[PDB]
Amino acid sequence: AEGLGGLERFCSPGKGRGLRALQPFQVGDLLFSCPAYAYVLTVNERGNHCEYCFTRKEGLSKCGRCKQAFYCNVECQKEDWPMHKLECSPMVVFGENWNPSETVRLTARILAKQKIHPERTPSEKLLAVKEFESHLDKLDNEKKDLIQSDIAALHHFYSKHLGFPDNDSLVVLFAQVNCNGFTIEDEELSHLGSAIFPDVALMNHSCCPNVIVTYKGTLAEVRAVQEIKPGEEVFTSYIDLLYPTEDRNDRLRDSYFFTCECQECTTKDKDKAKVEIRKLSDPPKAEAIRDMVRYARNVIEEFRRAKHYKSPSELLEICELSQEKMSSVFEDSNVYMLHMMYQAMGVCLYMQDWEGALQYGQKIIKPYSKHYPLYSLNVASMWLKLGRLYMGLEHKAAGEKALKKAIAIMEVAHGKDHPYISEIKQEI
Ligand SMILES: O=C1COc2c(cccc2[C@@H](O)CNCCN(C(=O)CCNCCc2ccc(Cl)c(Cl)c2)C2CCCCC2)N1
Numbered sequence: 235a236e237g238l239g240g241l242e243r244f245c246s247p248g249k250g251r252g253l254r255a256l257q258p259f260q261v262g263d264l265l266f267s268c269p270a271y272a273y274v275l276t277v278n279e280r281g282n283h284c285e286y287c288f289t290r291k292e293g294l295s296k297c298g299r300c301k302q303a304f305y306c307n308v309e310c311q312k313e314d315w316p317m318h319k320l321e322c323s324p325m326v327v328f329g330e331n332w333n334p335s336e337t338v339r340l341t342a343r344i345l346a347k348q349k350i351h352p353e354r355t356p357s358e359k360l361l362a363v364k365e366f367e368s369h370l371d372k373l374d375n376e377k378k379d380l381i382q383s384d385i386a387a388l389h390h391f392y393s394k395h396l397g398f399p400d401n402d403s404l405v406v407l408f409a410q411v412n413c414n415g416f417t418i419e420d421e422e423l424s425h426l427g428s429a430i431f432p433d434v435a436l437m438n439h440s441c442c443p444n445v446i447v448t449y450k451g452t453l454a455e456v457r458a459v460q461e462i463k464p465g466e467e468v469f470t471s472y473i474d475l476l477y478p479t480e481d482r483n484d485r486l487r488d489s490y491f492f493t494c495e496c497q498e499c500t501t502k503d504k505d506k507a508k509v510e511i512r513k514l515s516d517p518p519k520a521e522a523i524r525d526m527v528r529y530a531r532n533v534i535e536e537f538r539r540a541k542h543y544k545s546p547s548e549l550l551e552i553c554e555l556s557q558e559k560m561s562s563v564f565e566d567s568n569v570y571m572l573h574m575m576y577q578a579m580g581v582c583l584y585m586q587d588w589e590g591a592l593q594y595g596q597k598i599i600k601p602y603s604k605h606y607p608l609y610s611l612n613v614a615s616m617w618l619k620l621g622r623l624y625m626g627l628e629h630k631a632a633g634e635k636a637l638k639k640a641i642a643i644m645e646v647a648h649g650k651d652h653p654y655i656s657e658i659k660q661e662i
Pocket residue numbers: 336337340377378380381408409411412413414415416417428434435436437447470471472473488489490
């Protein structure tokens with residue numbers, strides 16, 4: 235049996251619904267593939283990727299009216315039109331004032347797909363969009379205010395062609411988009427867009443995941459990173475595994491209303507190395523260390539919101555200033571130091587400072603390999619960033635070693651026949 239035939243929908247105790255294997259799955263094996271029910275490309279990736287198939291290309295056929303949407307050919311342009319029509323005219327009319335969030339952009343595509351294709355889609359083999367968990371009973375004022383702001387934005391930019399249901403039905407739908415929604419990312423883990431994969435959304439969370447979700451354009455591919463036996467539950471990671479048990483569970487309680495009780499969460503085995511303190515002769519107080527963790531956590535959240543409006547020169551300054559204050563107590567291997575080093579590397583890449591970005595990457599990779607589990611995409615993308623930075627700076631010996639190390643992880647996660655692997659092999 236293959237695809238969703240060798241797997242089944244079942245009730246996981248204390249987790250609601252879940253997916254379990256009916257056949258053995260080895261490391262690297264493709265469990266199932268799921269096409270996108272609805273998908274949307276991020277504004278910052280326009281001109282680099284096709285709006286319909288997400289294929290990265292140089293020189294795409296741009297839209298005549300708006301000149302914002304880019305396509306492979308007339309076929310990609312015509313096929314994306316039922317979804318693009320909701321944005322083409324408003325982009326010309328509103329101009330700089332056209333600013334709907336990616337959540338609003340995607341929810342509009344779901345409402346359009348629910349109209350065009352009301353019957354069951356190939357994306358809904360085991361779980362349907364109408365059957366999705368919303369956590370309406372658990373929703374607080376903070377979330378309801380954000381959902382209401384999104385509903386108001388949906389009415390402001392998409393009410394020309396889309397007939398909306400009652401406010402309470404939209405509250406449930408937006409909550410379902412947050413609970414079951416995915417973000418399509420490339421080989422370098424750069425944000426490409428947002429999508430809905432109902433069959434993939436059936437899998438529960440674990441900090442020790444047995445599977446990984448990679449993308450082949452708009453198609454999500456689920457591959458094993460651990461040995462799965464028949465009857466075993468299929469688990470994926472909903473969050474970045476670099477952070478300790480506290481930081482991990484605070485995000486899971488805030489975004490998905492649950493507390494993870496897996497092996498890494500129970501034992502808290504990696505927490506010590508993650509929040510590593512320097513070996514000082516005159517160390518700060520236990521309360522002073524707690525203050526720096528609080529500062530670092532607030533600096534990460536402030537950078538998250540500042541990223542979308544502040545200039546790269548300002549963003550690089552917060553990365554540098556935070557690192558200097560944290561470096562007085564925290565080690566270079568510390569996860570809070572690594573985040574600001576990663577963000578500074580990202581800023582350096584936008585500013586096209588290759589030597590600057592390489593300096594950070596060389597300090598990030600060794601603690602990254604230690605903190606992250608085996609076959610992690612964050613480690614794979616870091617080797618991929620280093621390799622491409624070494625190759626570009628004519629250090630072809632160091633590049634070849636890093637790109638091969640990225641391939642070694644990606645052959646299990648993306649599969650040996652993935653187009654990304656073929657590109658990296660051609661770069662060598
Ligand atoms: O089925 C899944 C999906 O989750 C997975 C699964 C597997 C692997 C990885 C991930 C995740 O990493 C994917 N994350 C995607 C990003 N995403 C969010 O984080 C939304 C949460 N909002 C944060 C707080 C918040 C919670 C609830 C409410 Cl109601 C409100 Cl208002 C706010 C959005 C998606 C839709 C477009 C906007 C972004 N398995």
